[model samples]
Target chain A: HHHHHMSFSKNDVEIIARETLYRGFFSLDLYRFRHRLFNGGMSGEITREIFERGHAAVLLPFDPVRDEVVLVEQIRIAAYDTSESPWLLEMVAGMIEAGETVEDVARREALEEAGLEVGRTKPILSYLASPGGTSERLSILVGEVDASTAKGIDIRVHVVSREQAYQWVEEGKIDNAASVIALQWLQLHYHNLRNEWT
Target chain B: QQGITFSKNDVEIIARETLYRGFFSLDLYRFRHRLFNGGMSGEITREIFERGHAAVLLPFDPVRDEVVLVEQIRIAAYDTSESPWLLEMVAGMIEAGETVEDVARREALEEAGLEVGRTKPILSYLASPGGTSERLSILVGEVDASTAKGIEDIRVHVVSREQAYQWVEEGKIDNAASVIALQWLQLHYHNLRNEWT
Candidate 1:
């Protein structure tokens, strides 16, 4: 079997030109570069803008004893175009500030967004939210929480049974990608996680 | 659950300016919306990145019990610890007047050189709703795994369903759209296999 190990390193991408297009709340950088194609040829210099919003940490707070998951609801202006309701039911997530580890952001977000203290946190998965044009990566963490302490501060918070969350995923009600992925991962691994946490 | 219940109508866009116009564009918006407590709230400003949307499809062959995945270099991941070559589902942006299903089929052909037969829409989701207005629709499409491999700059891998799941477990499939689609298949594999066969 011929294993085609076609890989590209940082050196493969040559940036001929670069400029900062925006320097506001969210920054954007435009670059013109040529990359080695898969067929061992260099591609034409292509222009693309990279959205520079920093990465984030997303945490799904689960209560194994109560078999419930705490979710936050907030209005997202970006979702207004396609979603009927821009208010999305999502995991407790926040941007990763400088000098903050992913775990630090996860613990802080769990406390601030849902008022729940995360006991034992495990990394579920990490993913590029949108790699085509944005450099935003999200670290999904599953944390053990006490559902009784869950409270909504500035936004609406709902604690639902794990079964209910699955139903929402099936019904397309949970539209946030990170939330859906986290909930489904929980659905598949709940029993084992319950035993481990207990 | 009552902080503010405002629709597009209750919100007013005071001004809009294009911060950057390039392959992708960015806009700064100044707006005001009604507060749930009482009257109008203070003026709010946000920088919105207009990325439009995209469609993703995981091509699966029930007869062979295999799945087709594509690997490509994602420049946005240059600074991450992970490799620039990412394993992902076939995906493309939704062009003007193009349907989601159309993008799924077209991208499958263009990316993996696989012709899709039937597509089951898994779910639609906001990629990153905080600052970027990019929504992605995920679908599971039927494909002939044997014929789907190595197209243009995209390299395709036809792996067993179990192997695919293992890759995801090993954290190799790290793109949000691909992760969601694979996890959906993991949950609904038996039923989907039965239906497709």
Candidate 2:
């Protein structure tokens, strides 16, 4: 334990936990501890934790020829622990390499996760997964491709109707950052997207 | 020379002058003056030279025992040679005619796509003291995180109770406000609201 100001009592110092990095995702061993400064004179003890550096991106690929959207089913670790259904219906997404462009990451993730050969693409937007906590920023895009031509191997890909798309959205079937944003962008701008890009 | 007598000591002027010439700019000034009080420890005369303002909020959810956060690409990090995108609590510039509660609600929707109910006010603090004259006010709110509909372009998720606890425990969630708000909500969940009905 370490003290910097007299405002804190000597008992205020408590080491919470020692943490280790997991392929960029850091883990911690926690302890209950507190400081006297902010708790209105009452010392409050809680867990202190940290995470390592990592990056992720999502790709929403639309099939121009089939007029359908391509989605993949994957086992998301977060959902595995949180939701009853561990398999998430999501867009193609992956972690960004040390020196990869968002576009390159998007294209690579599309093929790697969904087996779709991406053609033309447009930027949707980029955002953090949880700024107050996680440093993961997800860059999302809507790409035009022939999902009907996609051949799935490791990841299962399906072309679904617009109504089916909305059902997934409402049911919390699609929850990953990239999948949600890409699909919503397609939902709101489907007609314009199809006409302008096709 | 005769014995020197001073009128004031440590006099500072936190002043700002706006240049209204070809280019608009703001200048800051800080100065001190020597003064002598009867005692060796002298009193210093001070004046407000300028005033600046800012706002911040603690994104929260009660029913879910969670907070509404925003995840977006930040260009500022790029300039620092860090990750270009960053995750943060939902926030916005406090526009004119808007209160802290107002921006909280608006930012909630824009960032996490939540329709907020009444808000619970939290603590606020300064982010940086050395260079920025910014102020922050944090507020927490309850939301239907389980069924919240995220916006068209934003990826919003209702953090699970177990996952949240684990993240905090494992250090996955590390930002100051996130840490403080989560711990606060966890401790106050049972008392923040009671079913008086």
Candidate 3:
């Protein structure tokens, strides 16, 4: 037994078996593996099914001039059981298609989902949506947009003042992690962002 | 259909097959729905990962302006660029017989060895409604950071609220639930501190 203070690397995990359980629109893989525990011992063989839905780019469209943000309303099927109304107000988000950079996906999604032309964009942060069961990572980008140009034929989009968005958050109306994180990021950096843009 | 409300009946799940069943399960769903544009979306095939739901709690000591966080190894993050050892708010999957508050309190005690005092619901959000059915309820609670204990080999860190926010800003704290809770605290720190104190 070696007592090392180094962090565990990818080599620490020994994948005994891997099986693809599904191969539809999304994929699911069952992995059986063991890894070195923190205290310097190998954990017993563990089994987990991971959802391989891939990565996504979530953009929060903010018009610095108006101090307003644009949000889209849509029915989320997965939220049917938990939320009273499945229709959620969320940011412009889309999966990063193959060979597309995160910024490309962000700009494209902003146009496709909200019909907004993104100006200067800043990355808020990157986070795993739910690492417990899914391998979906989202890169949140806060993009400068002109709220007047946001008109999409696919879904209903709303442009609300940042203060109103905060109120909605307090009232539990904005109920998606991406939107919550994005709005909170905006709340923290809004003043500086406004001054910098001005 | 702009103002019309939709229910379970509005969705027609043509078929659902369990693709995998293990610690977590994935179900393949072929369904169609009435679009807001007054027609049905073509038969779409989507895979939904059934992760149930979880509750996340951020324990804060208003007097000390310190926050308690738990660090543990996550196997799911083993292969990613991120470190498997994640510093996150106390969180636990809601078991069959527990309320969201109970899970929050229990996880605070179990993960960080911190007893939650007055708890306030921050917000509930779908962790990833795009693919997974995991909904997380975020709560901010009172704790004595000085009395925190670590169990199950978890390391407890008592950091100043500013340091915690710094970590979040530096992207060191990458967990969705933890980031949300910390950012929520940043947004409502003054109001919450006054209200709780």
Candidate 4:
């Protein structure tokens, strides 16, 4: 019976001011506004800095016959301190450039990052990376890949059994958002997905 | 697959300058990296967000089978979420010199008025690695639901395990930390229940 009732809607918000604080490869803007509070009155002005970036598509390359998935490890300067190490085990992903569909981006990343020739894709789910500070929405897809195209584990590229990937997530080895979500999706739907793909 | 692999020593930082400094800071970096093809790529100029990392904790009461979440207004979520006032797990920036577990316990006390026991980590993830030097660690801890309360605007909600999962499905709670924490419970709560309950 409990639902996320919108205490306020888009119509209820007043954009008092928005100033571009910085414009570069990625832009940052400052927002100022006030809205009707849950207590039934206009609250004071609130200001927040928002990082703007385009959405992206992430690929979860799967091979049913091999029962394996493709993973990539790269250094994220952002995660330099918080992660066990800066090099994170993640999925093949690319930002959605101009005029590109989500499906197209997924396919292109699958090919470029992992050398996978994906024929068809199954749409997974989407989430805002960190809605509290940024507007980077990401959609995930499960794509079919031929494990014959893969080699043994490279520091950058990995072809591991689906079970092992999930194990890494459980062990907190694969901890980035995209990889964790992808592995869990695989864990939760392995049987159905394997049947469909085979 | 190919060895797109390189160590931290491979990239050279040309220069860095502070572009903006406020509650949050931004910096511009000029750098180049050794490509997987055995050559250095063109120099890259990029702006990065430099905010401190944060620790998020969702306090669970195993005896009661519930979790305590806080409700507050998040200005940054104004453009992305249906409601700017979000119902989220207790979270706060991990100020320098503070252990992650300390921040987790501190936020819980300030936001939800609960004292947590030994903490368990769920995940340490980059909020989004494309641009920001921001990372977050999600943790779960044991707390007594009877001791939970709320602050002024940081209202508290004691949610049953079943209701919490449903709210996640209904999109009532849709922040990064919230979603990840809930999903972790779904996948691993079986053992957690067995261990703690």
TM-score of each: 0.93, 0.44, 0.91, 0.87
Which candidate gets the maximum TM-score versus the true structure?
1
Off by over 4 Å in 4: A1-7, A81-85, A97-100, A150-156, B1-5, B37-42, B166-172
Where does candidate 4 chain A have its weakest 10-residue lDDT segment? A1-10
lDDT of 1 by residue, A1-198 (tens): 112223277678777876788898888987677788877988897777889889999999999999999988766767777877666788999999899999999999899888999999888988888887888889999999999999876377888899988788888778887898899899889999999999
From the highest lDDT down, the ranking of the candidates is 1, 3, 4, 2
Per-residue alpha-carbon lDDT of model 4 for A1-198, expressed as tens digits?
112222257676787998898887787888888777655777688788888887789989999888988887766655544555556788889988888988999987777777788966887667677766776778888888986785322236788888888888787777777887777778877799999978
Candidate 4 backbone collisions, by pair: none
> Chain B TM-score of all predictions, in order?
0.91, 0.65, 0.92, 0.93
Best-performing candidate as measured by lDDT: 1
Provide per-model DockQ scores: 0.52, 0.02, 0.43, 0.36
After superposing candidate 3, which stretches have Cα over 4 Å from the reference? Answer: A1-7, B1-15
Return the lDDT, model 4, position B40.
Answer: 82
Per-residue CA lDDT of model 2 for A1-198, tens digit only, reads 111112122343443443332221222122334434321453345443222235666788787556688777643322321244434467777777888988899898788767778888887655544332233456677888876677665245677865577456544555444554455556656788788876
Best by DockQ: 1
Clash-forming residue pairs, model 1: none
lDDT (10s digit) by residue, model 3, range B126-187:
98887877899988999888888776446778888888988888888887998999988888
- Report the lDDT tens digits of candidate 1 across residue range B37-62: 55775777778899889988999898
